Structures are given as C-alpha cells and as structure tokens.
Coordinates of C-alpha atoms and ligand atoms in Angstrom, one line a residue:
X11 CA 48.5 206.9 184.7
X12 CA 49.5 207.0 181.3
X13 CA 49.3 204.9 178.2
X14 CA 49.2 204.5 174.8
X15 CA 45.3 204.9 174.0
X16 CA 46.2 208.7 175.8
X17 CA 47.0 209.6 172.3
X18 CA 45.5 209.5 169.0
X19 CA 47.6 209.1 165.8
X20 CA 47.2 211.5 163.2
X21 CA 49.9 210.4 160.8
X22 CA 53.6 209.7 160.4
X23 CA 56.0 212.1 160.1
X24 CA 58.8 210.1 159.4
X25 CA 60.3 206.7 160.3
X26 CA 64.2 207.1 161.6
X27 CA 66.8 204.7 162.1
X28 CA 64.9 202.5 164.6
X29 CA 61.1 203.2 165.2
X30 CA 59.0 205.8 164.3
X31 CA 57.6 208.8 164.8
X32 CA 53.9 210.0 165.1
X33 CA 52.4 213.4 165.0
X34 CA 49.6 212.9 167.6
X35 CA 46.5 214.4 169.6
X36 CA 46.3 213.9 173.4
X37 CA 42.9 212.8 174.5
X38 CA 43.1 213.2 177.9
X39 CA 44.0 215.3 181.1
X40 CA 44.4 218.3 181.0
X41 CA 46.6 218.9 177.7
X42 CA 43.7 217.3 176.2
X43 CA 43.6 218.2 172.5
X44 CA 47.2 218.9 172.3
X45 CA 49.5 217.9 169.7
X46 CA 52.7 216.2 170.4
X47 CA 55.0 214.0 168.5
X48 CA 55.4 210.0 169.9
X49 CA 58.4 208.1 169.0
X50 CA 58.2 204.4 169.0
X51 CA 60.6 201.7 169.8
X52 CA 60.4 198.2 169.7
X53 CA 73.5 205.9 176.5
X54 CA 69.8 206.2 175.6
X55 CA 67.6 208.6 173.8
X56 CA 65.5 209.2 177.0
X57 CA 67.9 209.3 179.8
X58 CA 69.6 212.4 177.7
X59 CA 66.3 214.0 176.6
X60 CA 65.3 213.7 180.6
X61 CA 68.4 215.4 181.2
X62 CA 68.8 218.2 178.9
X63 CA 66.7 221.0 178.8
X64 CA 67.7 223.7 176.2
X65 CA 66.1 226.8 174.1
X66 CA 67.6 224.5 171.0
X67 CA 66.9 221.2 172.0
X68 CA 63.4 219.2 171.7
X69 CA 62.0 218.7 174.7
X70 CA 60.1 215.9 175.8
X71 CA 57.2 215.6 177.9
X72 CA 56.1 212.1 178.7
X73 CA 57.6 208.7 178.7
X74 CA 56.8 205.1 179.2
X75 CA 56.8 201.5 177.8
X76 CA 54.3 198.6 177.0
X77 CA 57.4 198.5 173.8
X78 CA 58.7 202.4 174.1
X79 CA 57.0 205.5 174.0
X80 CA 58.7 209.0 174.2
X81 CA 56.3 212.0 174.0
X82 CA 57.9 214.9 172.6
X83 CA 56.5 218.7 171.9
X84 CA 55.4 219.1 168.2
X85 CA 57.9 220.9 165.6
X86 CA 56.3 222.6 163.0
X87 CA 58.5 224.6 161.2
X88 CA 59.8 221.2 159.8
X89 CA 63.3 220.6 158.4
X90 CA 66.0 223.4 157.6
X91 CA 67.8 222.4 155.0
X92 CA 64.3 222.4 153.3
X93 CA 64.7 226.1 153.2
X94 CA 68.3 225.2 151.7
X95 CA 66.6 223.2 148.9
X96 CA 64.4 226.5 148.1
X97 CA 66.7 228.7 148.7
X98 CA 70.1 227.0 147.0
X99 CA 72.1 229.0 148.9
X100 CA 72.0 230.8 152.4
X101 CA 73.8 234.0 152.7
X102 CA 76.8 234.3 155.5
X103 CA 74.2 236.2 157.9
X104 CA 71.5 233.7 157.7
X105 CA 73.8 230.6 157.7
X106 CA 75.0 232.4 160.9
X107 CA 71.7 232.8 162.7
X108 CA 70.9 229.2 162.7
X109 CA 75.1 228.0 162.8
X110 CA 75.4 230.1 166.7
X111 CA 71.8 228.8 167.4
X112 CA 73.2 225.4 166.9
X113 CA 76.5 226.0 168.5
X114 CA 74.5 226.5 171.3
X115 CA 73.2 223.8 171.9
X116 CA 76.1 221.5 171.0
X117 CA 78.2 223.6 173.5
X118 CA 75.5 222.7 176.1
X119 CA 75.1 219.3 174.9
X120 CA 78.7 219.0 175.5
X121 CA 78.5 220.0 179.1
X122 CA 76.2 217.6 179.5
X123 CA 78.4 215.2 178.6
X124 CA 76.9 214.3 175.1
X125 CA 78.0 214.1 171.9
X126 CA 75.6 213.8 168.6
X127 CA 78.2 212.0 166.1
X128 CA 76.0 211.9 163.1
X129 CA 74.7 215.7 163.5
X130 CA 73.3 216.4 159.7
X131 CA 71.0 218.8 158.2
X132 CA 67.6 216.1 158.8
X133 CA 68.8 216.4 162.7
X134 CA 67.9 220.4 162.4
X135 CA 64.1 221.0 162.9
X136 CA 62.4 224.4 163.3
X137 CA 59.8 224.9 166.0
X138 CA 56.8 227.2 165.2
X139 CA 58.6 230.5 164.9
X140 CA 61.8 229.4 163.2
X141 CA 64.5 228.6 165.8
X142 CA 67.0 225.7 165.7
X143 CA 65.8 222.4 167.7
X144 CA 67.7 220.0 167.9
X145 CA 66.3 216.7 167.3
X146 CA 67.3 212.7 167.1
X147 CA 69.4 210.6 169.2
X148 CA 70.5 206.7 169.5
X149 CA 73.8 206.8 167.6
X150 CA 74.6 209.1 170.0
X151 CA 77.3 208.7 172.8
X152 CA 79.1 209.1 176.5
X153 CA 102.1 203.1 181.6
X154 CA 103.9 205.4 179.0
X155 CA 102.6 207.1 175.7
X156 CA 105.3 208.4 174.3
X157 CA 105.3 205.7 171.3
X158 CA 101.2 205.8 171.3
X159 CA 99.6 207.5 168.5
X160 CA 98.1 210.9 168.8
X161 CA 94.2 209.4 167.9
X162 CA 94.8 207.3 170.8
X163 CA 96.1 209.9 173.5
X164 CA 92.7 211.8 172.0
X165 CA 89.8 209.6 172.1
X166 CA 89.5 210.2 168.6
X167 CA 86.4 209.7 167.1
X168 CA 85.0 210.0 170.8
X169 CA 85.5 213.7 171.6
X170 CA 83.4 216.9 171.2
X171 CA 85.3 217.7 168.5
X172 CA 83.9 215.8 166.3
X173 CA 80.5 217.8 166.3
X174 CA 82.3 220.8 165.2
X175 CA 83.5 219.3 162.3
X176 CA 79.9 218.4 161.5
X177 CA 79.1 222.0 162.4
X178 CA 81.4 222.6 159.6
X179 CA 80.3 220.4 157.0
X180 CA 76.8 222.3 157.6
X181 CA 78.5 225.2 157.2
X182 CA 79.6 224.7 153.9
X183 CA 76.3 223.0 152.7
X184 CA 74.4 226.2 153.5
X185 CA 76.8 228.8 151.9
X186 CA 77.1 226.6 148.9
X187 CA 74.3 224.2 148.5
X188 CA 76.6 221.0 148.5
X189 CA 78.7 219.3 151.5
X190 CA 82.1 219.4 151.3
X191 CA 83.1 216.1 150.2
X192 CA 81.1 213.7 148.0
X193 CA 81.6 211.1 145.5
X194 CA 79.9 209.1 143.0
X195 CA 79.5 206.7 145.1
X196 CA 79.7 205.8 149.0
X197 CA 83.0 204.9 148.8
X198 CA 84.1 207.3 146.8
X199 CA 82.7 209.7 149.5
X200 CA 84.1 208.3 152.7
X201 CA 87.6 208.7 150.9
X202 CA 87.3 212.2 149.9
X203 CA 86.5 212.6 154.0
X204 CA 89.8 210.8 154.6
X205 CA 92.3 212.1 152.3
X206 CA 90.6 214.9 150.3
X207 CA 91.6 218.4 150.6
X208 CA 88.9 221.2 151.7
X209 CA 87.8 223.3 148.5
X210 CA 86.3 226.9 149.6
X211 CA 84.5 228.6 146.5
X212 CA 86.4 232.3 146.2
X213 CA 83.1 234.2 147.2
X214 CA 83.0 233.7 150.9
X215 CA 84.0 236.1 153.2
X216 CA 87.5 236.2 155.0
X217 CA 86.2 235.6 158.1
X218 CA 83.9 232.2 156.9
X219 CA 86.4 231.0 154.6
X220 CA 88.5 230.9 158.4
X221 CA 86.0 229.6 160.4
X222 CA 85.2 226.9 157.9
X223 CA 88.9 225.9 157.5
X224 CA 89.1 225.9 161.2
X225 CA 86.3 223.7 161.4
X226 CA 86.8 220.7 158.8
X227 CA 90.6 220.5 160.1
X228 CA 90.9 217.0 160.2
X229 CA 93.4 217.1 162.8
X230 CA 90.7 217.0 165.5
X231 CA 93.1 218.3 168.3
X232 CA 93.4 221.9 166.3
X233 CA 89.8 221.8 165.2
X234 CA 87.7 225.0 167.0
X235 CA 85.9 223.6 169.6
X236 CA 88.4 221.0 170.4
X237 CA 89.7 222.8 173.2
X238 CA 88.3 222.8 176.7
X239 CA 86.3 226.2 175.6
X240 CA 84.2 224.2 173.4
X241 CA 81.3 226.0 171.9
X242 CA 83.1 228.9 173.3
X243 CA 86.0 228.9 170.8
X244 CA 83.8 228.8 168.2
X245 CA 81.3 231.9 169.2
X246 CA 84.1 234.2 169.7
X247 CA 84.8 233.6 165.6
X248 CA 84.8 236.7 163.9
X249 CA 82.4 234.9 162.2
X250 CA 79.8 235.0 164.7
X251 CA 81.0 238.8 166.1
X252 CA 77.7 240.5 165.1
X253 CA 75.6 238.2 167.4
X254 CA 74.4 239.1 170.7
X255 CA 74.4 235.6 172.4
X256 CA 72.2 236.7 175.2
X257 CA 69.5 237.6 172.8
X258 CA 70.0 234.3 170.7
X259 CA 69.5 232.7 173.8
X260 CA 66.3 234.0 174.5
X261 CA 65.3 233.8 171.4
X262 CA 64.7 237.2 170.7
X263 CA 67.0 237.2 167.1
X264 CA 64.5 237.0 165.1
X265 CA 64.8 234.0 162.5
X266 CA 65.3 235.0 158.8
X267 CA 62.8 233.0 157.7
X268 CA 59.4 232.3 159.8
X269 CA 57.5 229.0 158.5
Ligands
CL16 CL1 86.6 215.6 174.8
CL17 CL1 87.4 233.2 150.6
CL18 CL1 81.8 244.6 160.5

C-alpha cells in the first residue's frame, strides 16, 4: 500500500553511520504534499522508534522494505549545537532548557528499556519551534561475587548510566564551548576519558559545577541517574529547580532560541 515511488526526494540531509537520510515530499494519499524525512538502509532502529512515543523523541510515521525505508516527521530547526557554534557559549539557564528537555526523554527512553550509548550534540535536533528531539539509533542497545569486580556486578558499559555521563559531557560543551576531555589526537582523547581528571572553569554556578561533577563521575554506580530514580535523580538537581516539568512536558517553556 506503500512504496518507495510514494515519495519524492528533494535532497540529502545527511548520510549517518549506515544509510542515509532524505528530506522528502509525499505524493500520495492523503498527506499528499507533505514533507517527511526517509532513512535508507541497505535491537533495531524501528522496533524502538515503533515503540516509543515522546514530546522529545522523533517520531516516525511509515515503515517498510524493498532494502529499508523508515519514514520519519521532518525537523527543521536543524542541529543544536549549531546554535553552540554561534553562540560559543550557552548560559546556565539556556543550557538548562534543552539539558531537562533531554533528560526527559532519556528518563523515558530508559523506561523503555533503551539506552543511546553514543548520545552527542549531532544526536540533538530541533523541531520547528525549538524543542529537543531526539534523533538517531543503531548503536544503540537492550555462584558467588564476592571476588568479582565491581564493572562486572554493574553491567558496566551496559547500564542507563552511561547516558547521564553523556548528558554531562553536553553539559560542559554548552557552558564552555569545548567537551570535557580532548586530545590531540584520538588516542590522546580516549585516555583523557580514562584517567583524566574533570576541569570545571571557576565561573559556573555552585549548583552546575555539582551537577556536572555528579554527572562525569566515572564511577558509574555514584553517577546521578545511576540509581533506580533515573532521570529522576537528575531533575530534582538544584540545577534544574526553576523548571516546571509539567510545562516542559507540554512544551509550553518556551525555547530560548526559535529557528
Ligand atoms: Cl541499569
Ligand atoms: Cl564553580
Ligand atoms: Cl534561586
């Protein structure tokens, strides 16, 4: 009932790890003259996006194979950290509109049983009117102990927790225009992650300079958000105590910056 010669291609707008992705024009039906995106592909990306269904969180629309095709609604506020580049620097309160946005959808990603993994600031896209959706998946997942190490007894590297340290290395990146770690080289970088300590500039707040050493805590067991209140532990930062979650939810908070 559906197929690919439904949808016209107007161009590329960008090609991911794997396929790509068109912007596109529906030519028939109803929705006729509608523009969607299409990704294109020669647990999975569309068993999740079937599932979850979130304010923050592109939705899709149609799916079906030839070899793949995904149809998903069209963002076009583009990328976020594109307003980083212009701007250099967020401000605590705009970094916090769009760091509970995303925490909201992470926390409900995470109910969902989902982790992102790789979350970085190219996974953050903007719909129409400025609010957070969240966007790509595919590297994307899910006798005695006393002598077994703690990473084991965690499922580290497998857990929820490691999305809040992303959430934190975002943080950073938008209060300071850098991520937290980085080297000269790849390498370099990884190892810094490993073994580096966490520099906060002196300007930041109490309360973000907290929340950010709460977040990249390399002990993932103490991380915030590693507990079984999830996002939850993370939204009750002081951080976060001016936002009205109901109203973020709805969308109602409006954006600091609209496209
Ligand atoms: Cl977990
Ligand atoms: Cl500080
Ligand atoms: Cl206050």
């Amino acid at each position: 009932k559906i197929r690919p010669e439904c949808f016209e291609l107007l161009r590329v707008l960008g090609k991911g790890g794997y396929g790509k992705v068109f912007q596109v024009r529906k030519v028939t039906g109803a929705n006729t003259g509608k523009i969607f995106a299409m990704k294109v592909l020669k647990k999975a990306e569309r068993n999740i996006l079937e599932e979850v269904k979130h304010p923050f969180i592109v939705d899709l629309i149609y799916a079906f194979q030839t070899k793949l095709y995904l149809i998903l609604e069209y963002l076009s506020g583009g990328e976020l950290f594109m307003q980083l580049e212009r701007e250099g620097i967020f401000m605590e309160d705009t970094a916090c509109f769009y760091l509970a946005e995303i925490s909201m959808a992470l926390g409900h990603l995470h109910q969902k049983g989902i982790i992102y993994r790789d979350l970085k600031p190219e996974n953050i896209m903007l719909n129409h009117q400025g609010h957070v959706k969240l966007t790509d998946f595919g590297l994307c997942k899910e006798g005695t102990i006393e002598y077994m190490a703690p990473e084991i007894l965690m499922r580290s590297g497998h857990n929820r927790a490691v999305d809040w340290w992303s959430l934190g290395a975002l943080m950073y990146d938008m209060l300071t225009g850098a991520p937290p770690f980085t080297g000269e080289n790849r390498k370099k970088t990884i190892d810094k992650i490993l073994k580096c300590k966490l520099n906060l500039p002196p300007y930041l707040t109490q309360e973000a300079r907290d929340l950010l050493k709460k977040l990249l805590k390399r002990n993932a067991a103490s991380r915030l958000g590693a507990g079984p209140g999830d996002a939850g532990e993370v939204q009750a930062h002081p951080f976060f105590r001016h936002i009205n979650w109901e109203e973020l939810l709805a969308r109602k908070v409006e954006p600091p910056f609209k496209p």
